[PDB]
Symmetry: C3
Subunit: 347 residues, 3 copies
């Protein structure tokens, strides 16, 4: 009970502690905030999962988070946002995916130089988008990370002498799918892989650890992540996608995030909003394959562009339904507290 | 006189009728609203023209409109907008152009499955765009349809095992144009074809029927549609476009819409605004060829992206001219009533 | 002292002169406003530099500026903006770069026809963006020019029978860089070339003349332009860019503009804002190579898209630092007056 939720008691106790422990807590919260989790223990679990997948990726992500938090402190950003990990969760993804999309293999120490540089731009993006989106009461999601990674991967490319990137080839021929070779076990295993591919990790154990951390933060968030991954798998099956792409979790890491965001987190949790979150996850998977095909023509991966776009689209949409409630941005903590607040406001 | 204009008397009489007749009226108005027409009889005429061109395309468009209206009703959207056909006119285009850009020929019944799915997203897009564009008092035009069709055609592509799309090849060699083979009769005939290509129909009879329906709704709108198609033809001739592209109406279906919108419809009709509409039609044709060339590099058709972009750009532009008047979004019915309202407000 | 700054005395004396002299002054100010300079004498110097580089390019730019100013007068835009050259500085770039990116060589008189047409659309863009951006207190920069040039170059392309454009080939193989062949003299000479490539001119004498004109307007702006060009060169060296691209000034014409804008011009000049301008110049160079690589896949040059995007991103970003001050849009004249106003407001 002490480690569940956002761990407000730990933050209150650390508010008067030496700044080193506070900085460590901020780094852990920023690591956890990729899946909309404000738990430092969930951040430790996510770090353990990243180390299980690849220690080099974990090192790059931790370095990116540290550099982003330090730069946000240097830029005199809001201290409340920095304490909650909202300044540094984009750079974790930036560093991890820069290590993922590198063509020079593991432990390429020179890659530590661009990573920091891009981690130097994550706060600025996070600032510049926020002051706009907070005008319309909308979150930035992973838009700063998407912009930074697209800019970096366009600047370097596959043929960069210093930091070559993994080549992205657009689909040229019609795939041949043997539907008799579809494996139910692999389809079931792609759900943890789908959840784990949020950090670009294809290890089923890493995805299971991520799901466990999310469940530690909030069981409803873990359930919505699993359902979003399953819906991404279903959308991939509906479009006759290659089985290797479905088994790799490339179809479920956007829909899982969309289901987490639209289910309980930024909309009050009701069965109507549950169905809306399911529909948003399906739409997010379809937009994900569309964006992947579109940016494959320019040599870029879609990453989490479809998730941000679809979630913003569904959040901006307005309905004359009292049971479909959009939570205020200042009261969004986690689905249980969000539902309690919505029930209190309803009466 | 009873069937001209928006047919407000029919709506008033149907407001207390059984909901089946009201739903039929809403579907007809949504069909007609592609060309900014709120006339159910014009919707019937447009359906007849679509059947003349291709019954399969008409069936897909009708199914898309019905599904979009039902989904907008399910989402508790504004009943006034649904009654006027503003929730369902984008899905008509979505279904018709999904049938048009299909590589599996006519009467591919499986294509009825994705169409409905895309018609499920047309209301949401509209809503998500409306709440964004109503702040600055701007219409959504066919932006939801453009976004939905771009996402669908990127997701499927030409090499999809289930729903392949027609291949789009960027221009590779310089065209050889024999200017002695230019036909005045074909140039004149491309005006109805350019008007009918709004629905993706290249039949001159279909375009003539569409022009007749628009004239039934409003003569000024039909005149502006014809002038916009002619201006698109002129712009195509100015850039040495292939004659087959001009004869197919691919150059005049965006400028015609731009001239309809900017002439009398969303700006008060004056000779100054008439010249502004002509300039907007020329700019829209040039932006149309530019956007088509740009999106051919990613394997996508431009469709009505240039029309929406150019019309929004011309509507946002502000001048210190009293005779260049932008009609309020709540008072926009059709050019005759718009001009009457503008004359009343001027005095 | 009479010709330094904006020469408000000359404007006051010309306010009651015949309109021909006023129009000439407006054209000169519009020519100079590309580098955020409101000096007609600097406009004359920039015209001299353009003539030194290429008389055809100077003729096209002058014609574009004249046409844009004439149509902005015809469109009843704000007279104060027209008098300060803010309606016509985008068409100077449009005409000059349309002459630059033409595949038909120099003195192609038919190119005078599209140029005017694009100069026709420059005021509208300048209007349409302004009303959108003045809400958030942001400048339009060269966004109208970028939009117009992208639209034109997409519409025509390399294979246009009438107005072919220079082919843009994306990078296909990894460059081989002989670092022992790097020349310090060429690196130093690329700074004036980097400043002169704002107008698409690769002549070092032209860049030196441009720097002299900027220094005549304001020494701080010239210093920031030189530092931005140097930072662009450094960023190009950091990414192992080909030496020919660095020597051609293709790496420094965006960072120089970003350093001019962010240093003293649109943000109050302090050492903190000086470091922020340096960081913005580095970010602008990296975004410039990224966007160049991105639009090379669609056959388009990036031009000044990265400069506008990065400068807007850095201007929107908000910090809780009193020394990092964003000047109001109505009081922005030049860095010396900007700093004086900021110092007066601080106390
Ligand atoms: C936006 C893309 C670029 C981001 C910033 C990249 C900065 C890299 C660090 C500069 C020096 C790198 C030297 C590496 C030499 C080598 O790889 O052998
Ligand atoms: C795909 C290659 C390009 C690089 C990736 C996109 C980088 C975008 C940087 C600028 C973001 C927008 C800044 C604010 C603009 C506005 O005024 O709305
Ligand atoms: C809106 C879509 C909802 C999800 C639909 C999931 C459908 C999964 C199965 C679709 C393809 C079934 C196999 C057909 C191919 C074959 O067996 O030859
Ligand atoms: C892209 C294909 C899938 C698109 C799915 C769009 C539909 C999402 C929302 C589903 C309906 C939710 C209705 C909730 C209110 C109610 O049930 O009364
Ligand atoms: C070409 C790639 C596929 C097609 C993608 C079309 C766009 C679909 C999603 C649009 C979401 C728009 C959200 C806007 C949010 C905002 O204005 O901040
Ligand atoms: C955004 C692109 C996708 C839009 C939604 C597509 C949903 C298709 C329906 C799912 C089942 C398809 C079965 C096809 C069977 C076949 O063609 O053999
Ligand atoms: C902005 C201008 C719009 C109107 C343009 C009208 C058409 C002019 C170009 C078409 C005629 C070209 C004739 C020369 C062809 C040739 O003989 O090679
Ligand atoms: C790219 C093709 C050229 C586009 C040029 C658009 C010009 C718009 C037309 C403006 C005409 C004048 C408007 C009324 C002013 C007046 O004459 O009193
Ligand atoms: C955005 C597209 C281009 C802008 C508009 C270009 C208008 C050109 C009008 C004149 C066309 C005919 C003159 C060229 C004749 C020739 O070169 O043979
Ligand atoms: C590659 C060809 C196209 C180049 C860019 C041309 C863009 C013309 C229209 C710009 C958008 C104007 C409307 C903006 C509306 C809004 O954002 O609210
Ligand atoms: C993040 C901004 C960095 C700006 C300064 C970067 C300076 C880079 C200097 C060149 C890098 C090394 C070149 C030689 C490498 C070799 O010989 O292989
Ligand atoms: C793309 C790589 C480079 C990115 C550079 C980002 C950092 C810009 C410079 C920020 C300096 C901040 C100075 C004010 C704070 C202070 O020192 O008091």
């Amino acid at each position: 009970g002490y480690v569940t939720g956002d761990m407000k008691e730990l933050a209150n106790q650390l508010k008067d502690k030496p700044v080193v422990l506070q900085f460590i807590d901020w780094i852990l919260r920023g690591i956890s905030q990729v899946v909309f989790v404000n738990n430092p223990v969930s951040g430790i679990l996510i770090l353990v999962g990243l180390l299980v997948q690849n220690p080099w990726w974990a090192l790059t992500g931790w370095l990116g988070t540290v550099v982003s938090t330090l730069m946000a402190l240097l830029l005199s950003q809001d201290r409340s946002l920095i304490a909650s990990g909202l300044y540094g969760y984009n750079a974790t993804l930036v560093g991890v995916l820069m290590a993922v999309f590198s063509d020079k293999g593991d432990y390429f120490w020179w890659l530590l130089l661009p990573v920091c540089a891009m981690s130097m731009t994550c706060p600025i993006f996070s600032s510049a988008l926020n002051s706009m989106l907070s005008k319309w009461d909308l979150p930035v999601f992973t838009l700063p990370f998407n912009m930074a990674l697209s800019m970096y991967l366009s600047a370097t490319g596959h043929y960069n002498p210093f930091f070559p990137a993994k080549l992205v080839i657009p689909i040229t021929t019609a795939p041949q799918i043997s539907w008799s070779d579809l494996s139910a076990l692999e389809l079931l295993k792609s759900i943890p892989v789908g959840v784990g591919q949020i950090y670009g990790c294809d290890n089923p154990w890493t995805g299971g650890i991520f799901l466990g951390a999310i469940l530690l933060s909030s069981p409803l968030m873990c359930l919505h992540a699993a359902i979003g991954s399953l819906l991404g798998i279903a959308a991939g099956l509906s479009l006759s996608a290659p089985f290797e792409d479905i088994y790799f979790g490339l179809w479920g890491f956007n829909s899982s995030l969309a289901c987490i965001a639209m289910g309980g987190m930024f909309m009050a949790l009701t069965w109507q909003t549950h169905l809306l979150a399911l529909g948003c996850a399906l739409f997010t998977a379809y937009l994900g394959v569309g964006m992947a095909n579109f940016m494959a023509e320019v040599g870029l991966p879609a990453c989490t562009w479809p998730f941000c776009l679809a979630t913003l689209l569904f959040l901006i949409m307005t309905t004359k339904n009292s049971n479909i409630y959009k939570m205020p941005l200042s009261k969004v903590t986690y689905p249980e507290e969000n539902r309690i607040f919505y029930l209190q406001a309803k009466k």
